Amino acid sequence: PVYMVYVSQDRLTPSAKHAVAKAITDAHRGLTGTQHFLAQVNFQEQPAGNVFLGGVQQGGDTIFVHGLHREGRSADLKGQLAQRIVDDVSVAAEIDRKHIWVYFGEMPAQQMVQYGRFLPQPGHEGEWFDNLSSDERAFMETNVD
Amino acid sequence: PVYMVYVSQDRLTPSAKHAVAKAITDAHRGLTGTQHFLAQVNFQEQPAGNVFLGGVQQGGDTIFVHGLHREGRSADLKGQLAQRIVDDVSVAAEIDRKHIWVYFGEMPAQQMVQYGRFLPQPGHEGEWFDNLSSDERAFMETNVD
Amino acid sequence: PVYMVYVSQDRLTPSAKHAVAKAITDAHRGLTGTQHFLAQVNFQEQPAGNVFLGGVQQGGDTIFVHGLHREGRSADLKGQLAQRIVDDVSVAAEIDRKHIWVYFGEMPAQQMVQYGRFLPQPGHEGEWFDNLSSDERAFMETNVD
Structure with missing residues (x-):
């Protein structure tokens, strides 16, 4: 997947960015089975x-996660992952859950490319990798941490 | 929704940003009934x-609005909102309409999280908030202006 | 189309950006017939x-293209396009294709606005223009190069 993470400038130090990136990657690896190295976390500061929000200008405390996945997983699984x-x-960002927004978008694997290669259908990452x-x-x- | 608003650096003052967020937010509230505080405007400079555009480098006058919504609204309402x-x-940015691009993408509300909570289906945002x-x-x- | 192109600051000179924007725009015009001026390339540094990637911090040599299209094209064409x-x-960025990721998302044309106007269906563009x-x-x- 590609997780776009929209944050304020300097809200996350290099260490906190790292921890937030491991945490997103680990949640995705653990709930789907997709290898660590197939998950990208892209911080946009x-x-x-x-x-x-509601027209009121915010401080540096909001986090918006826009997750881009391939089609094929149940709504139950995606809810658990969100x-x-x-x-x-x-926990990783030391940020209250009220400050956190998360949206998942989905597209056919047939029009998703990572490392210059077309992605397999979800569940089939052992094959394809081999x-x-x-x-x-x-x-x-x-790309494993 | 989240409205990603892509603009050139310094093309908008703090006040014009404020005006454009208000224009978008009031547009969403007015046509969907969603409460002001459920609408995020996120400026990407x-x-x-x-x-x-067609390979020709542009100045600072372009605006691209990527609106991310819940599924469930009619094509007619989405046209009036765009x-x-x-x-x-x-009017709020003092930019000619020929510089403005707007794209709406939709997702099931079951995979959309705001303020740490999953969104309800479009309509009855009232019994959800309560x-x-x-x-x-x-x-x-x-977060209401 | 809008192609959001996420790169590291300074990895692309002004001339390299022009080349990348030209390569994406010529490829889109090439395979869909959509005239040059209807394709935005929008660089996010x-x-x-x-x-x-997999929780491991990357250097300056990664590129993610998020392409936003209208619905109605075939999987085979979208595959060639990507x-x-x-x-x-x-070629244009002088970067190995293992560093390149490309996702296509699609939306109905009636919720996509460009140059202040609604788009036509993916094959009806000359008449729209007239x-x-x-x-x-x-x-x-x-805006043609």
Whole structure:
């Protein structure tokens, strides 16, 4: 998946960003079975005061997670995954759950590309990984924490 | 909803940002009945010259609005809401409507989280809010302009 | 289309951005017939270190293209389109294709606004263009490269 994480400038130190990224990745690995190295977390920092709720300008405390996944998982699984991201980003970012927004969008795996390769259907990541060239496997395997 | 609003750096003052967020938020409230505080406007600023149209580098005058909504509304209501966003942002930003792009994407409300909670289906936002806890209501209620 | 292109600050010079924007725009025009001026490429720079793969912090050499299209094209075409964006951005940015990720999302055309107007269905674009006012047609032509 690709998790776009919209935060304020300097709300997360390099260490907190790392912890939030592990937490999102670990929740996704644990609830779906997708390998660590297939999950991207992309932080988008903007100056504080660029978020408005109900038209009221906010401080640096909001977090919006926009998760981009492939189709095929149940609504039950996606709800569990959304809820664990709320809980685990709360802890990792030391941020109250009330400050956290999370949206999941889905598209066919047939129009999703990671590492220059088309993605398999969810559940089939063992295959697909095994049918990748040695260089590609080794290169993906560096992205495990 | 979350409205991602992509604009050039310094093209909007704090006050014009404030006006554009209000124009979008009031458009959403007015046409959907959703409470002001459920609508997020998130400004994404980038240096001028980062937008290209047909391969031609642009100035600072482009606005792209990516609106993320719950499924369940009619195509007619979504058209009126996109047109109202074009018109009222044009006035609040003092930018010609020919510079404005608006895209609406939808997701099932079961995979959408705001203020740490899952959204209800479009309509009965009222019985949903009333059933949040006292402190969640008090926190949400402060974000109304 | 809007192609959101997420890169690290300073990985692409002004000329490289033009090349990447041209490669994406020529590929979209190439396979769908949608005229040049109807394709936005929108670069979102962030400092290096804001991207994590499998929880591991990345250097400055990653690219994520989020392409936002209208509905109505076939899976086969969308597949060719994404493959061509991978190859042509690899060349244009001088980056190995293992570093490239591309997701396509789609929306109904009736909830997609460009140049202040609603889009037509994915094959009815010349006639849409003719029915515009000459003023709107003129503003549109100045954006072809």
